[PDB]
Design a protein around this ligand. Structure first.
Ligand SMILES: Nc1ncnc2c1ncn2[C@@H]1O[C@H](COP(=O)(O)OP(=O)(O)NP(=O)(O)O)[C@@H](O)[C@H]1O
Ligand SMILES: Nc1ncnc2c1ncn2[C@@H]1O[C@H](COP(=O)(O)OP(=O)(O)NP(=O)(O)O)[C@@H](O)[C@H]1O
Ligand SMILES: [Mg+2]
Ligand SMILES: [Mg+2]
Lengths: 463, 463
């Protein structure tokens, strides 16, 4: 209706809503029972769901209520596709589909709004993982003429009827909770002077696309460190074949993808290196590195504890899916040394993205050091406000908050984020905690931080 | 946006919201603790508040989303002003202001939508009780030419700035939760081919008015049973003087209102009957019926247990405020026998309005008989659906529901109302109750009903 009118509308939905969740919090941090914990669980779920409908609806409304103002910055696109693929990776693997990204050429470093751009790709990507039962999802980006970039999310789902393709970018249009995820993309599009559309074919799949005039910051520096070298993919999955190919050729390699351990060999150069999907495992997890060939197994993070058996069988190494082009390159260049992927490093988890609020650089260092040793990707900020700045703009799985930090108190920094809408869990560090909770903080940790404390938290808030 | 789109929007806000409240219910019907009951209380409050913002916002939206269709019926206007005054009576008396209604002449029985008309008067009345700190509120209605009726809600509040008087009937316009109560009245107005407006004067008060072309069903039959008789009002309150006057003259009496026990006497006929407000009580509740005069004390329901001392002092009787013109007339005609007002009948409460769902007419009779003996005004319906019909259209304080009733199961009748938005508490009667609660029922009662059970419920859900 108006922006002033909405700013207080939000306060009035949110305030009682945070009220509910603060209460649910406190309750569960008190001895309860069968049923009497049954209830406080099923309440925090109904509450959490409603909060995401409310943020969705207010997000939508605040985007048609003013101009919007972008905070333009240099972003690494390959790094962005990867972050999104890696956030979606858990949803996809638990339905038994694949998520992967590739670029065909090096693209430029770009001047865009990282957070808003990511929001578009998450909307397309989530949709894709929700709607496909069969192959998987491919994130793609390619430069076009006019200083323009074009992002693709392709999926082996059931596709979109030809005439239904205008409909679905409108508010509260569904398949038959909000039905706003695309409406929100339609309005971030126009704010970047972009367009968005959809293709594919009914019953084969859907491609969702975004095409935005952008500012370049950089020469797409063109280092091809796989010049010469040859690489075979054996995977029965279409997405791992397509993406893994393009990732090779982006590093200046030649790629032979095959459905089969036996086909790969059949049509690939003899000096070629063999990438083999563990989806080809026969009974007992039988996977034979074909006699007298350099071979790398492609595992999902869950398949991590197979890595020892498959190195004894004579695989020279492993890659984790979705494939990082950087770790891909490091492994092929063992046609002759790289660190263990952070996603199987965890003592429990896969790689939780973590925001660290600590103002002492050296205490941050020691926290970061135990964090990255349970596979966490960690961002650090000095004070309680440029935390808020970076806990909206950001996307993260946990938030570690100092309390006696200057700028803003830990407690009023929590409160601030909880009242701003964002739902990410928050653990406090220090050496009067019942207000902490109700204020909107989920856990407490004894500072200085410790291996075994940090594990508890990683297992509790990342699964 | 659309009505189809809104019908599922509502489902999606409501469903998780009922989820929260079902859970809050179950929790509180299990042994808890200091804090661990502290929490389940403060949750059911934050939830209940949010539900009323949601119903408000969906109500508003569903009124601009279609035509609306009125269910026209014969309504008694004097009976309607009274019902509203009596619903507002508790809010007003606990801030120490007065609510009263009068008509000047008998009006016709009218063909209107009772529920929607009431909703307008509640919106105006609530506002009035919320915004006045000083005198009180007067509900008024008078016939005009064109078959038109005009309703007034006047208040000794701080009034409305002359130019602010268009503004305030718009959505999300405030004083500086929703700010929708008048927006909703603006759209029920237009649906009755009415107009609505406001008058008064800054810092003296505000009159809120509704003027609707209507259908007449009846001759305003003109029985004046106080022809001849004279009546003096002594009250320091402006509203009780104004309303109490007009109520006399509507029955064809002559009225002399005075601020004072001593002024009344000073200028009233000697044969006149004296109505004296207990707000004139001096210390210890001293109130002298002036020697050798027929006098009736006007009490608020809380002042009920003073009725014995004041009959010994020589008052011939009492009226409860806000004054019922019917009980007024019955008392004056003791210039020479009426039942005890239902509002001080309660063993605990004042008069809870109660909806009774029972299909056996004779079991309804026995329930009604204990109900009306704790001051309840009771409506009865045969089955679980024309309950829904009459628990929206209606306004009530408790709902007594049979379970093994034909038409609709008690449980799916609850569920139906809880999903329709309405918040009124619901107690079930019979001889597997944990689903009852979560389904949206608040209490259980052993059928057949009993004095002491019914008291519990009246004290728990009416205060
Ligand atoms: N990859 C896809 N394949 C097929 N249908 C899709 C795909 N992505 C989106 N849709 C359809 O597009 C509609 C609108 O999508 P969207 O606005 O994201 O709503 P939602 O995902 O249904 N609800 P919300 O969770 O708020 O995002 C969905 O209801 C689907 O009907
Ligand atoms: N009797 C009154 N005296 C003075 N101001 C009033 C009165 N009634 C209404 N108002 C003003 O009118 C505004 C709009 O009223 P309304 O739409 O009822 O919103 P609300 O009462 O503020 N919020 P809501 O509870 O949804 O009704 C209020 O915010 C007050 O500013
Ligand atoms: Mg979606
Ligand atoms: Mg109001």
């Amino acid at each position: 209706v108006t922006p002033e009118q909405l700013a207080t509308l939000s306060h009035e939905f949110r305030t009682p809503l945070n009220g509910v969740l603060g209460m649910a919090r406190l309750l569960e941090n008190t001895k309860l029972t069968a049923e009497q914990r049954s209830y406080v669980t099923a309440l925090r779920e109904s509450g959490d769901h409603l909060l995401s409908l409310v943020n969705d609806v207010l997000h939508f409304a605040r985007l048609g209520a003013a101009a919007i103002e972008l905070s333009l910055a240099p972003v690494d696109i390959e790094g962005l596709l990867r972050q999104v693929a890696e956030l979606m990776s858990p949803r996809a693997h638990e339905k038994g589909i694949e998520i992967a990204w590739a670029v065909s050429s090096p693209l430029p470093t770009i001047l865009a709004d990282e957070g808003r751009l990511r929001q578009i790709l998450l909307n397309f990507a989530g949709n894709a993982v929700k709607f496909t039962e069969a192959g998987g999802v491919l994130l793609t980006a390619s430069a076009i003429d006019g200083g323009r970039v074009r992002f693709s999310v392709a999926d082996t789902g059931p596709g979109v009827a030809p005439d239904a393709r205008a409909r679905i970018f409108e508010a509260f249009v569904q398949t038959d909770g909000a039905g706003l995820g695309l409406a929100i993309v339609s309005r971030l599009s126009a704010a970047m002077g972009g367009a968005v559309g959809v293709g594919g074919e009914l019953g084969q799949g859907a491609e969702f696309w975004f095409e935005a005039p952008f500012a370049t910051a950089a020469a797409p520096l063109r280092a091809a460190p796989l010049e010469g070298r040859n690489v075979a993919i054996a995977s029965p999955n279409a997405i791992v074949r397509a993406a893994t190919a393009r990732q090779i050729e982006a590093a200046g390699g030649r790629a032979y993808a095959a459905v089969d351990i036996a086909s790969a060999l059949a049509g690939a150069p003899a000096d070629a290196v063999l990438l083999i999907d563990a989806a080809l495992s026969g009974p007992r997890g039988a996977l034979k590195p074909p006699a007298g060939r350099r071979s790398v197994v492609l595992l999902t993070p869950e398949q991590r504890d197979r890595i020892d058996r498959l190195k004894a069988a004579g695989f020279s190494g492993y890659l984790i899916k979705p494939l990082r082009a950087a770790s891909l390159v490091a492994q092929v260049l063992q046609a002759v040394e790289p660190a263990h992927d952070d996603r199987i490093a965890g003592a429990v988890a896969s790689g939780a993205r973590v925001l660290l609020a600590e103002d002492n650089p050296i205490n941050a260092l020691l926290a970061r050091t135990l964090l990255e040793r349970e596979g966490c990707i960690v961002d650090r900020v000095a004070d309680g406000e440029q935390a808020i700045a970076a806990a909206s703009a950001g996307v993260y799985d946990l938030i570690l908050m100092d309390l006696r930090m200057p700028g803003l108190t830990g407690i009023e920094a929590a409160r601030a984020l909880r009242a701003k809408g964002v739902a990410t869990p928050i653990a406090a560090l220090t050496a009067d905690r019942r207000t902490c909770l109700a204020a909107g903080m989920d856990d407490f940790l004894v500072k200085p931080l410790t291996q075994e404390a940090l594990r508890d938290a990683l297992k509790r808030w990342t699964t």
